[PDB]
């Protein structure tokens, strides 16, 4: 009957799920791929614009990792 959770651990999962969602990104070229690009541009555009927020916040998530690691050397 002892509570167990770790915040220093919490971030790891958060790191994990980011790279998992660079994966869900999907795109399909074509022999035409121009008319496709028409559609696909947005598709990528959204995906990209979507992703940037993910990977951006991914850092924002890990942004707090680095100092605590370093600052302990100073403690």
């Amino acid at each position: 009957a002892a509570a167990r959770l770790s915040s220093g651990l919490r971030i790891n999962s958060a790191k994990d799920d980011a790279a998992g969602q660079a994966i869900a990104n999907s795109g399909s070229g074509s022999g035409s791929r121009i008319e496709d690009s028409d559609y696909a541009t947005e598709v990528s555009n959204m995906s990209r614009a979507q992703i940037l927020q993910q990977a951006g916040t991914s850092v924002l998530a890990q942004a707090n990792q680095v100092p605590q690691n370093v600052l302990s050397l100073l403690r």
Binding site: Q54, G56, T57, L74
Partner: protein, 1238 residues
């Protein structure tokens, strides 16, 4: 004497320990490389100041640090603002990294064994000019040869200034002082008066009369009126004695030491309370340092704080000092009166009030011997009082002391609980108040009372993790004193999350001390916490006198009440205050868990009301997340599961986030939410599944925890199981189950990923195929129109520069993949059974012996085996020994990059009889797969698709032997159809049950009868023809009623009859949810019907057009929109160019309302760009449409203010996602050529 170079060092030796709690120490030295890079750039300089200044240098010193300012003090180290640096003045040395195991003196004494206590004689503290003068200048009798003149004595100054070499011997000679040679002492021969301890800039003509008012030499020259001018300066306004030794002896005897009920192991504890002096008549807060505060003592004074905050302790130092030889302030008085007694106050009183401290030995003591003697001398009088108001009637303190100073003008420090100030402040001088407790004195304390057992080491690491959740935890050292019990388990604790353990102790502390009658206590705790109830309600901490009625405590104000709440000095009289945000947050849980005590029933309805204000899942994981732990902490068996019911009830099903953020400004009390929430939200934004998947963990985390208060058996079991159903999670939950025990858990799915690498391929560059579009030229208008734009590089770096931050955290981790006990506490039982293990992989970077030999056993006890892969094309044969158990993977295999060739000889040799296969890219081989493919295969649907590559027919001129259970298939015509392809596909389908077809580009060519004549009962239909037939399409294609979806595009060809033939049969056969409309032939005329009767569809989503707008199409939508029948539709789009015209979007936006059934609408692909008024009409878009996640419009190019029109009227409906107004623009010139015109 300065020095140079000699890069210093910090200990590598023991630091291998910390590498456990942190990641890797080997990267520490790299940080310390900055130090020599920094130090050299600093002035190595030389002597500056004697220590007593240095405390001021630490005014801005960051409080959170390990070492104590007063540790640096005796080191005399100056505090420089650059980084944290502190500076040896006698030595040269300068330090950054602090050590818990090591006092500063060491580091100074170790590293530069030269000038400091080796008595090169730099500096002095506790400085007086009495022990410089009063006693000393006595012996200075004959201390020199005869001097009547200042020149011959000036000569003596030859020796004086190694300390200084700053203040001129002249000016002192100009004041006529003599250097005797002992230390730096200088003396005025006439008055015989001396001084020392010279701050640069000290005038004697300043100093002299202050310390020697009656000096004749002075008074014979400088005249008079000058003095009261000069007299203005910093320091304070300036058995008869045998009774004092008693006073001395009293404190000299042991009374105060061993005040902590633990033990007095260190009886004198030097860690000191940070005092602030606030000004009465204007706001200035004037931070101070204690030794300074000493000399600041003039007459009456404040000494303000709350409770257990150091009230008595601080004064107590004075005496135990005042007796002993120490810092100046003491050395002036021959009397100190310490009485903390409120008990005396009712009394008419006596000198015997003091006899409390006397312990008898009195009786000549009399108003005679006191009162007029107390005014005999004015100044050596001193009192120390714990008391307030002045209400107690005493000729002594009341009728005399605080009332009339200018009869007395004597000094007092008054311990005052904060709530007692605002009655007697007007008599009271400028403030002496306590900011809070410096986090270091704690760490100072925690040093002493412990053997430093790497309990404190384990502390800060938390208080690095938590920040606001940490650095504000300590306010009263009493909280430390609560910890100071320090047996609690064996100690403070060896246990993680030291927040509760603090609080958890602190309560049951106050029990003990105050448990004589604890009935009022709990009652107070109970009735006040109803305020803490409002913690969940909102953050409003004002707590006026009124809402206290809901708490009911009010002015009843038992001394107990203070231990929670306080007041605040007013700008305007009605006001109030409370202790601290975190302590409050924990009060709530306790008060909360008073409710949900099942033996209380009528009232627990309250909590039942509260806990239902948690309604979002994101309130659970962030907002009150840290709070709920306080609840689980206090651990009342009956409550917890009843709570758990609510929480596990929360997800419902298929409602992702009812409200992504209901967040208040309560969040500020914890920062991480802002990060997490977005991270959460963002995560949700890419993958609706994984969001709910992720969120499911922390709930289950939270869930299981409350169960592990006491009893998971009865009330816990049923709730969880419901939650578990149909879910998909990640293997971290396994070890995360303590719950691993009860059952091999079912009714769910599980995911796993391995990705270590950065991306490698050309798949993005197809913008190169957008180059022929003259992308150089188009950009023209909008002084802003830049702001609309990005370039690949510009974005490329943005992304990569951020991965670089990961890259740091990548290396220092000596860390790879899951399963500590995660597989083992998983596999601790033998008969584990796992239904589905989902595996996404990217690169071989995790290919390794043990790491996979770990994953070797993962596959065991997991009944189905799935895969999706990108980066690695070769990871298969890396697996084989892991799967040489032939564990029957089956399920499906997703692939992007290459098949490794002789790899799938494995997938051959596997022979699990897979259900399905997914390969959408690169190339494939039969000697990869399609050789003898069917034999053990034939189960469920496949995808094999390539870009331009031929030989998709040669895929299976082996398949006709096979007799398939597939019934579901996906593949294209990789040419303008070759009868082979048909001949390939033909025989198949009549012999199979024909479900869910997918074809990328069917070249319709000839005899799609031989394709679609057999077509029956499909849902999936993906064909998009470049060349048509329009026999099947018009005839048999819409002869099969039940269909959810259609994927169709690629140039509907112009027989408007055929369009009708479609349109009619489209309208005639309508079962559909959704579709892809074929791309127009000029359809536009009749595409009204492709709207008009689309009201008939029983279900709606995914409305799709690449064509057909400019005509009435809009109200044709809007009619069908305003009138019902497109209700519950999920989507809208158009990709057009021609059919794009501004003119009607407003008309399209004329009335778009009354469909809050929708998600996204996209208007896009302008080579030209589209910027006009109808951005006006946007002000009504999101507002009246209610529910939308998001939009995509790439035409907008909007005025930023009109984008302020966007961004401002965006969020009125929601907190969450938005329209995407900018693409990643292929890198191009962005010309202003029209701007040439203005």
């Amino acid at each position: 004497d300065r020095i140079s170079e000699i890069d210093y060092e910090f200990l590598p030796e023991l630091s291998a320990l910390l590498g456990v709690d942190a990641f890797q120490v080997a990267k520490s030295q790299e940080e310390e490389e900055h130090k020599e890079r920094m130090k050299m750039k600093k002035g190595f300089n030389s002597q500056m100041r004697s220590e007593a200044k240095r405390l001021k240098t630490f005014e801005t010193y960051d409080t959170f640090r390990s070492w104590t300012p007063q540790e640096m003090a005796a080191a005399g180290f100056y505090h420089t603002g650059v980084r944290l640096g502190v500076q040896c003045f006698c030595c040269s040395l300068i330090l950054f990294g602090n050590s818990l195991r090591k006092l500063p003196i060491e580091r100074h004494k170790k590293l530069r064994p030269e000038c400091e206590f080796l008595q090169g004689k730099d500096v002095g503290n506790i400085g007086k000019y009495d022990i410089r003068v009063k006693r000393p200048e006595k012996m200075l009798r004959g201390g020199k040869a005869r001097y009547h003149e200042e020149e011959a004595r000036l000569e003596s100054f030859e020796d004086w200034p190694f300390y200084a070499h700053g203040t001129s011997p002249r000016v002192l000679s100009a004041a006529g002082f003599v250097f005797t040679g002992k230390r730096d002492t200088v003396q005025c021969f006439s008055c015989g008066g001396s001084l020392g301890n010279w701050e640069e800039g000290d005038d004697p003509w300043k100093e002299h009369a202050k310390w020697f008012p009656k000096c004749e030499f002075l008074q014979s020259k400088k005249s008079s009126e000058e003095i009261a001018q000069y007299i203005q300066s910093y320091e304070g306004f300036v058995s008869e004695q045998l009774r004092d030794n008693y006073t001395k002896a009293t404190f000299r005897h042991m009374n105060l030491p061993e005040v902590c009920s633990s033990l007095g192991t260190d009886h004198l504890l030097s860690c000191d309370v940070s005092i602030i002096s606030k000004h009465i008549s204007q706001p200035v807060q004037e931070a101070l340092t204690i030794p300074e505060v000493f000399s600041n003592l003039n007459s009456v004074m404040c000494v303000e704080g709350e409770t257990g905050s150091g009230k008595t302790t601080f004064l107590k130092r004075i005496a135990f000092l005042w007796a002993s030889g120490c810092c100046p302030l003491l050395y002036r008085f021959q009397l100190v009166f310490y009485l903390s007694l409120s008990s005396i106050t009712p009394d008419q009183g006596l000198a015997n009030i003091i006899c409390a401290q006397l312990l008898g030995a009195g009786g000549c003591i009399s108003e005679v011997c006191l009162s007029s003697s107390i005014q005999q001398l004015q100044h050596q009088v001193l009192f120390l009082l714990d008391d307030y108001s002045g209400l107690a009637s005493l000729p002594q303190a009341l009728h005399t002391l605080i009332t009339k100073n200018y009869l007395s003008r004597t000094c007092l420090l008054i311990a005052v609980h904060t709530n007692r100030v605002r009655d007697i402040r007007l008599y009271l001088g400028t403030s002496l108040e306590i900011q809070e407790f410096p986090f270091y004195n704690t760490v100072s304390v925690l040093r002493k009372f412990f053997s430093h057992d790497i309990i404190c080491v384990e502390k800060l690491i938390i208080y690095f993790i938590d920040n606001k959740d940490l650095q504000g935890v300590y306010k009263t050292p009493l909280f430390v004193a609560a910890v100071c019990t320090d047996w609690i388990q064996n100690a403070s604790a060896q246990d993680k999350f030291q927040d509760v353990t603090l609080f958890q102790s602190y309560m049951q502390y106050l029990s003990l001390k105050y448990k004589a009658t604890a009935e009022p206590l709990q009652a107070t705790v109970s009735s006040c916490g109803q305020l803490a109830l409002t913690g969940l309600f909102s953050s409003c901490f004002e707590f006026n006198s009124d809402d206290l009625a809901e708490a009911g405590v009010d002015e009843d104000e038992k001394l107990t009440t203070l231990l929670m709440s306080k007041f605040t000095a007013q700008r305007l009289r009605p006001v109030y205050r409370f202790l601290g945000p975190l302590f409050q947050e924990f009060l709530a849980a306790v008060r909360l868990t008073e409710l949900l005590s099942s033996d209380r029933q009528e009232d627990q309805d309250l909590g039942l009301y509260y806990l239902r204000q948690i309604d979002s899942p994101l309130k659970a994981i962030n907002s009150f997340n840290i709070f709920l732990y306080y609840v689980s902490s206090h651990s009342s068996s009956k409550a917890a599961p009843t709570v758990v019911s609510h929480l596990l009830q929360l997800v419902d099903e298929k409602e992702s986030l009812e409200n992504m953020s209901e967040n208040e400004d309560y969040m500020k009390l914890h920062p991480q939410t802002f990060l997490w929430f977005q991270f959460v939200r963002g995560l949700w934004l890419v993958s609706p599944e994984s969001s709910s998947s992720f969120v499911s963990e922390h709930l289950l985390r939270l869930a299981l925890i409350f169960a592990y208060e006491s009893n998971t058996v009865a009330e816990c079991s049923p709730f969880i199981l419901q939650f578990l159903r149909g879910k998909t999670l990640a293997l971290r939950v396994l070890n995360l189950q303590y719950f691993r025990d009860h059952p091999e858990s079912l009714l769910l799915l599980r995911s796993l990923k391995v990705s270590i690498n950065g991306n490698k391929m050309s798949s993005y560059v197809d913008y190169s195929f957008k180059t022929y579009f003259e992308n150089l030229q188009p950009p023209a208008i909008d002084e802003e129109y830049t702001s609309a734009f990005e370039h690949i590089s510009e974005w490329r770096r943005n992304f990569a520069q951020d991965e670089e931050i990961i890259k740091n955290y990548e290396n220092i981790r000596p860390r790879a993949l899951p399963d500590i006990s995660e597989g083992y506490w998983k596999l601790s039982p033998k008969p584990c059974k796992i239904p589905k293990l989902e595996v996404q992989v990217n690169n071989t970077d995790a290919a390794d012996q043990a790491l996979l030999q770990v994953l070797m056993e993962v596959f065991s006890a997991s009944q189905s085996i799935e895969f999706r892969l990108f980066n690695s094309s070769g990871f298969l044969e890396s697996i084989c020994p892991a799967l040489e158990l032939s564990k029957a993977s089956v399920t499906k295999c997703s692939m992007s990059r290459l098949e490794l060739s002789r790899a799938e000889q494995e997938l051959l040799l596997t022979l699990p009889a897979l259900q399905s296969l997914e390969v959408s890219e690169t190339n494939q081989l039969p000697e990869q797969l399609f050789h003898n493919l069917h034999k053990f295969l034939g189960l469920k649907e496949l995808c094999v698709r390539l870009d331009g590559k031929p030989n998709v027919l040669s895929v299976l001129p082996r398949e006709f032997p096979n007799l398939l259970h597939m019934e579901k298939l996906s593949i294209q015509t990789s040419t303008e159809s070759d009868l082979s392809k048909l001949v390939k596909f033909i025989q198949n389908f009549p012999n199979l049950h024909v479900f869910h077809l997918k074809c990328d580009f069917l070249s319709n060519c000839e005899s799609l009868m031989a394709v679609l004549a057999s077509c029956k009962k499909l849902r999936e239909i993906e064909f998009s023809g470049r060349c048509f037939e329009a026999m099947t399409f018009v005839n048999i294609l819409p002869n099969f009623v039940s269909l959810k979806i259609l994927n169709l595009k690629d140039q509907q060809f112009p027989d408007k009859e055929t369009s009708e033939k479609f349109a009619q049969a489209l309208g005639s056969l309508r079962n559909l949810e959704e579709l892809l409309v074929p791309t127009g032939d000029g359809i536009h005329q009749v595409a009204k019907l492709i709207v008009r009767q689309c009201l008939q569809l029983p279900c709606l989503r995914v409305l799709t057009f690449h064509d057909i707008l400019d005509d009435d199409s809009v109200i044709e939508i809007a009619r069908a929109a305003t009138s019902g029948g497109f209700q519950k539709l999920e989507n809208l789009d158009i990709s057009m160019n021609h059919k794009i015209t501004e003119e009607g979007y407003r008309n399209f936006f004329q009335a778009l309302d009354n469909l809050p059934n929708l998600q996204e609408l996209n208007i896009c692909r302008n080579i030209p760009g589209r910027i006009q008024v109808q951005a006006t009409t946007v002000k009504a878009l999101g507002q009246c449409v209610s529910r939308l996640p998001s939009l995509i419009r790439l035409h907008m190019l909007s005025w930023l203010l009109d984008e302020e029109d966007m961004k401002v009227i965006n969020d009125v409906k929601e907190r969450h996602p938005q329209s995407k107004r900018l693409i990643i623009f292929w890198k191009l010139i962005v010309p202003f050529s029209p701007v040439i015109l203005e």
